[PDB]
Symmetry: D2
Subunit: 502 residues, 4 copies
Amino acid sequence: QPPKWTTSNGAPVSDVFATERATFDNANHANNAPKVGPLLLQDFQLIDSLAHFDRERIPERVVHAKGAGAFGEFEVTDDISDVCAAKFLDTIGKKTRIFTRFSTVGGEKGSADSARDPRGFSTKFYTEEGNLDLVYNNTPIFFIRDPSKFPHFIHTQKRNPATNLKDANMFWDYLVNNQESIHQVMYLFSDRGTPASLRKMNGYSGHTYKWYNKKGEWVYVQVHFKSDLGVVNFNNEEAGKLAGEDPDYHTGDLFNAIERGEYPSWTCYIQTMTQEQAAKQPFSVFDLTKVWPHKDFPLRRFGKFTLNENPKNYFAEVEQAAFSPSHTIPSMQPSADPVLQSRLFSYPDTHRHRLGVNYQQIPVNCPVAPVFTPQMRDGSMTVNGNLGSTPNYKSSFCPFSTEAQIQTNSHTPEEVLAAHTEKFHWGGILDSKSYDFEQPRALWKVFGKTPGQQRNFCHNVAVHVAAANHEIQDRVFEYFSKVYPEIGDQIRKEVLQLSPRG
Amino acid sequence: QPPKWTTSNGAPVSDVFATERATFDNANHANNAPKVGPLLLQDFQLIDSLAHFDRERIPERVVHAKGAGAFGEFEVTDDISDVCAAKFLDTIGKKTRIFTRFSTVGGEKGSADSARDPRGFSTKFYTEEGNLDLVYNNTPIFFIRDPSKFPHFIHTQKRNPATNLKDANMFWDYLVNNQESIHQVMYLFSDRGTPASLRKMNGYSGHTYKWYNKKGEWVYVQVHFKSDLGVVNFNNEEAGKLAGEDPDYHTGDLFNAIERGEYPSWTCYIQTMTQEQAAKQPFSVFDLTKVWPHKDFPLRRFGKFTLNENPKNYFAEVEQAAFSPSHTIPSMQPSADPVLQSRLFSYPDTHRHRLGVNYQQIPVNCPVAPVFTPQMRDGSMTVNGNLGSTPNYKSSFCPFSTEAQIQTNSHTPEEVLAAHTEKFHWGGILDSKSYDFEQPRALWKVFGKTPGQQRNFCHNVAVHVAAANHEIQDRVFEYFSKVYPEIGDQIRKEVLQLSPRG
Amino acid sequence: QPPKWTTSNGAPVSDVFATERATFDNANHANNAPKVGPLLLQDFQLIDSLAHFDRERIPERVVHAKGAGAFGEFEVTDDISDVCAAKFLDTIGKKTRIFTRFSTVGGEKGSADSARDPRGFSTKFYTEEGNLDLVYNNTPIFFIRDPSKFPHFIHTQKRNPATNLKDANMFWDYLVNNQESIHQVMYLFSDRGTPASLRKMNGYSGHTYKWYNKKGEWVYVQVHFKSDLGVVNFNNEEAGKLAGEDPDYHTGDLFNAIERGEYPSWTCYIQTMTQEQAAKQPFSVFDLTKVWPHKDFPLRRFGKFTLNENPKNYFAEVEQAAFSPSHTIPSMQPSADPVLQSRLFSYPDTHRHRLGVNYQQIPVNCPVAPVFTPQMRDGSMTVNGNLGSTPNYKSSFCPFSTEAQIQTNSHTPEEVLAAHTEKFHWGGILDSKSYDFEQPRALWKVFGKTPGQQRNFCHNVAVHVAAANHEIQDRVFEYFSKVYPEIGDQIRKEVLQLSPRG
Amino acid sequence: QPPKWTTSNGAPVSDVFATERATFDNANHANNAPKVGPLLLQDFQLIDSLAHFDRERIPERVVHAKGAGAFGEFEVTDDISDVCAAKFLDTIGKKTRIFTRFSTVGGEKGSADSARDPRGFSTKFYTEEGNLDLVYNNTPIFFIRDPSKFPHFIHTQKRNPATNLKDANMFWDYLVNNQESIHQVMYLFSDRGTPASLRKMNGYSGHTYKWYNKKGEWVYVQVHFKSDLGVVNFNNEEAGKLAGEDPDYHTGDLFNAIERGEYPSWTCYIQTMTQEQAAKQPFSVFDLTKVWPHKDFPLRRFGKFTLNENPKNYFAEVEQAAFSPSHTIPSMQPSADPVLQSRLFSYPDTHRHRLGVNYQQIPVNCPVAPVFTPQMRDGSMTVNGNLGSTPNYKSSFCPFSTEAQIQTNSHTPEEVLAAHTEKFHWGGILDSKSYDFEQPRALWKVFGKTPGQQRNFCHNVAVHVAAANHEIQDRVFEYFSKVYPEIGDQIRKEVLQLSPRG
Ligand SMILES: [Cl-]
Ligand SMILES: [Cl-]
Ligand SMILES: [Cl-]
Ligand SMILES: [Cl-]
Ligand SMILES: [Cl-]
Ligand SMILES: [K+]
Ligand SMILES: [K+]
Ligand SMILES: [K+]
Ligand SMILES: [K+]
Ligand SMILES: [K+]
Ligand SMILES: [K+]
Ligand SMILES: [K+]
Ligand code: NA
Ligand code: NA
Ligand code: NA
Ligand code: NA
């Protein structure tokens, strides 16, 4: 009943550790016990094992490398089929399997779980119509609304190219010269930048999406996932201490929660707005640096999910999980958010580099809907039979069905094109008085409704910018003072204690 | 009933061919029917299909790239358990599933099946004790007995580095300076170099292996797979005409034979010799350029196999098939043939590069025996679950079994070592009088027993070496004359007609 | 002095072929000359050499795998700065270094040069504004005008998924159900499908491009490279016979021409038309299955190029060469031809798969213009220094320049957009009377201007389609009848000779 | 003049952040400034940039992933040509460029530089006879003397397969069941396990090597690199506190020292013994868990080196640095140390996976000696010319030189072989009285020459093993008691304070 140890080709071994050698004769030695001589090329059992060891590592995710995952279940609790025709949403009580990967953004594989960063909150829905990936963050906004900036931004959040050190000069240099970032910089430097538990943070679509009901009518949609335990944060000092005591604290917190039977859960809501309402708003629905104010666009519950099952093997199920915003179902479509648009290409592109072209044959990534793609064949590590003899083009010798086209309803026309295609840069140095700082001003007031939050924000910025040199510091005070002047000045005063000038 | 056409994530499509575009207004045009404008990045269906198309190709085999394959069944017909304790051999009537790949050596993926070359004949036995790969050729000898020469030799059989053309001058320059090659050269240029059908040629281990019985006694073994249809060949002109009319002839011949129920079959024999017999022979059992004479080491039948099932998908089952001499079972071990010894390393090495580290999880390569390698984990495209939570070392928390070592019997000791390790080159320029030219002379005598074979052999060499320059041609005549001077002169005469001088 | 033979780390070897072994004692053997025993893992020279050998192969191009190349020189011979501000065109007599690769389409790397196929004619211009790639074929049209059809089409031109054989049934099944293919199909089965020499064929942009002058005015453009030796073709039987005798005929022809100094050269022309002209045509300038009639849009010479330098290493310069339509200069832009659009993505995508992310650091692919991409860093096999310590974002610490944007002149506006984005399928079954069959009828009349070309065309089709089943054959006869009924009947008659019915 | 920002193909860009879109008409909106619509596939500048970003990451090293490096200079100070004929040692004052990489072992990228671990101390010497890699550690011993154990051991030093957390249970389960490990375990849990600075640690060959002089006489060698600043360590609490404050401390420490001209240096010594002396010792020179006592084998100085130049780009020079013990020069050979032997295969094996087959063409890895390997050609990312048209085998048409064989002097013959090859396991449960515990007892006494070192050792273990379960704890106490019982008692006392029992 105990399994036989083997080689990769399945032949039983007789000793796990012994290896083959042309023994030297040492019988006359003071210590003749060893049997030692040059190793032999024919020791398959050894070379098999060393060559596999030598290839264990695959490239880490270019961002969001450090992660933790679980499986679970999503359940419809309200009817929203007036908004969305999705089959997994079409019945109250209908359940769907999910897999979630939580992550930080900037850190590599050995980095701390408690670092200041946005958190990835990425969920795969295994539906009867295909795998739906909701690739969300723990924040409803982001630093950019121009997709060309992401390599620049991410570089400045990581390490200097000569030293391999983190560098506050470049970190802040990028942000003060691309000032659309300020809304998410404030959220990042609140205490939500250091959640106390992955079970105690929210997820947000961030982007606007477009959902279609069975009549072909579409609305714009924001999605909100709210922890049933609420948002609970560490502060800057707690998080930094924990980084040196348990860099894997959140991984274990989630795992142990699930082993105990204390399954974390989330409630799911949408905001919706019509094209006619969008035209009336002071912000674009395509602007990822904006939220939709709750008073004008209230949240509407539609479901809940629970993570109740730890992975059996982390590398196979978590490290190898692939999520893409372009993995959708017919009723849920991307908006023209420039950042989302670029994400549609970027995830599959990176997946093919990191995992291989057939990465969706890896079990965690397999759809449960039947996949039928006759024209997509071969590629490295084809393990699913490659559709056998099925013709590999749209053929007369093989029948198939297509769906009927979701025809857009005249009641809700698609957006009308302007007269030409153009290039556009939606960013840079912005005016203090424009609506681009009004949401950051609103975030400051939201801080002020909870005692301690404004002071923590200013302290969290100061300990970080104190490391940058004095000229960058000054640009940073101006930058926050474009929100409210008192913010930049409270930060300047604390930075001057930490970083003296004389 | 017909399957729905989908994308890679399982989402049904509505149109197989339509693609998204920012349409230009052409309503006032002379022909206003087209709807054309710049393509949109958000067309996942399209980009999904093209990105997969762009990665269809995996690297081809460095040698033996062009092949054909079939599944079948091997059956024990005689008891040789006195020679070999293998479980798949341990009962007359016992059947084992097999997979065979046939191939040429030098040619690439679109080369002619009917070209002059050795033919590969590699079979995977899916046994209870693991996958046994018998990686054989259609010749019992080979060009080399020094492993370092294989890159040298193979390069001269392929293309000039500057022109990408075949080059008679390097082809023959290699051979006349490494004269251990002549035995296999004569076989190559006999009509067996152009088999009429893969169902009508033999397979041979070529190397000596060492097989062990339940008592731990071992003997040297040569293996012979003889077609139940006999050896049937094309002549040089048939084979060359076919290169242009049907370069896939053998591939279709095998496939059609199986489709119509004419299942090809082979009978399996061994030759055996003890260490005491080996010590008396004029040749080394470790010399791949040597056969064992039949009158002295007669063939002993043990089984048969039949290829009776075509692949469903050529790429997934044939192009991804991986074979290695070092994939064996405990009762069958390699001898110290230096060429075989380096093949133990080179095939798994090249497999990892061509297919990926986990290529034994591709279905055709999967063992049917239970595989248990707790210390070999992760790597690209882990699709078998990666052993779940099983500890990844030899641990107390997880019990396992090993086999008992096959203790070598004092009645057949292992070979005794000399005093020191050393470096050795077993080739180069050789003496006409030595035993290294004796088995070539015997092959000449064997040609002579069938009318036309001696004539054809000289013709087959002549047409090839006439493309070399005159100084090389001279060395070639001189090389064949080390066998019998009649041979070199007979070839010189015909080469002079084809390649006039002065 | 002659160089020292080394290992890969530069250590001089003492013997090229000797290898290290734990020698067996065979002093008492009849033949004791061998020094043979198991090979040692510590033989770096052996293993280093075999491990490299094991990794020689990279994936072949998914199409156009079989190819031949040469470096040369483009020279401006007429001033066209009224049409195009490209710097490499800005002076009569300006010389630019080029690299050209020719190829077939469906054949793999070992396949026949003389096969019936379109030929690729791809040229890289190393200009002071960047590397411009003109990725052209030897035909001015192509089988598709929907980018999604390419994988389907190419698959049908290649091998059956189960048998790995070419398959006339799928070949013609695709063509007869996607009837826009017929113009290029007729070009293919003319004798231009079997050129006698890469030196004796033309190149064509095929797609419409859009070229801009210093004022921002733009015109649609078609480029023609006409061989100074004119177009010379084999007939079907010569090509088939040469497939068997010299599958590398074209490669040797090109190489030997340059070796002996008979440098091939082409003369370069453009056709041009304005947006206003385009609106009057019965064809779209975005339709790759269409040409521009010569008497309406006459050729205008602008230069010439000569191929005068053979590669020194085929693998390093030809096999690793990478071309993309999206590698362009600022004054030359793509049109909304839907096929050309998808090619902008597909080629850099497949390059990263086939060659690695940093394939443009491979010497043949390097630009001679200074590259400065601070935000594009790292990746496998960074060999160019990786910009040293240069910041990896757009920074205040590193000064840089950007050119000015070519502002589109109000004289020649960009194309106006329609109201909405949409999905379009530009093909399928077409009406015989429509203009989609008019340019095919004209090609027939061009064939008629030369005795035998019409009958040769029908013969070339018949011998190919005779292999397909009788239901496919029937569809093919109607297909060609849609051009003119006499064509379908001529082909039916000969196929009946070859493929009897009764 | 400042450089022009370009695309990868060298075309200058006009704007660094603007991207193309099919703009939606929002002229009527409350805020009509945005120009936003779906992104275009033809935006090469964007897709080029994103596709490169998507591929920045290569696999991290399977071990020693976290690292820091610098260039420098080695200088001969004393003559040892009586021991070694290396050309780089043959003259007093001779200088050789070096590159050094330091690293931890277990930690991934992003982990703490201050972690308890061995330190990699790895150095590449660019000699005129080839690149010599001295792949050393900061300890003269290691955990194993059986190569098959390295994957087991490393796995237990890293993360649990299910949770992805470090696991003290598997960490100690491996060590107490393979008790040859204890010598290095004591060194690891001394304060040398947490150096204060990479500049303040020693390096050691660990393995015995064999060095040959010009007469062919060889001795066994051990190499010692002693920091000119001495060995300076943190205590456990300092190490841990620093992990949270500055996980990149050692990296910055080395960089800034060099930046400010405080170049670290090391003095280089050897121990040597003849085969005659080795046969008298209580330990095998092939045993990596042993040192040579200084009193019997005193250090002999021969040179020094200084790190005086920081890398310009960390990824290109440090991350892509590749070292291997089998990169050597003819006068420096490996011993039959079983661990060392397996390292000769394993490092190039992983290099080809991690960096590609042609990784020695990456600048930091290039030899400065002329490399000439005609039989090693092609492969992915061939960037050095591939030897042009040089023949790719040992050819009559290319002259070359080989060096003379260093023929072993009969005054120092090679080791004599026993009768047979065999398999062997040199570890497991060991007897307390055997010599395998003598050097650990001696290390205990070394600790006791300095106040508090014995107590710090026990504390450093106890805080680690306190996290294991009580049965594993009990086994750790017995394990250390096999050295001296007082050691286990002390550890048990402190563990009980941290891990109380009922
Ligand atoms: Cl406050
Ligand atoms: Cl590899
Ligand atoms: Cl004859
Ligand atoms: Cl890729
Ligand atoms: Cl004590
Ligand atoms: K948002
Ligand atoms: K495809
Ligand atoms: K043989
Ligand atoms: K497609
Ligand atoms: K055209
Ligand atoms: K040692
Ligand atoms: K090689
Ligand atoms: Na011994
Ligand atoms: Na239209
Ligand atoms: Na001998
Ligand atoms: Na606008």
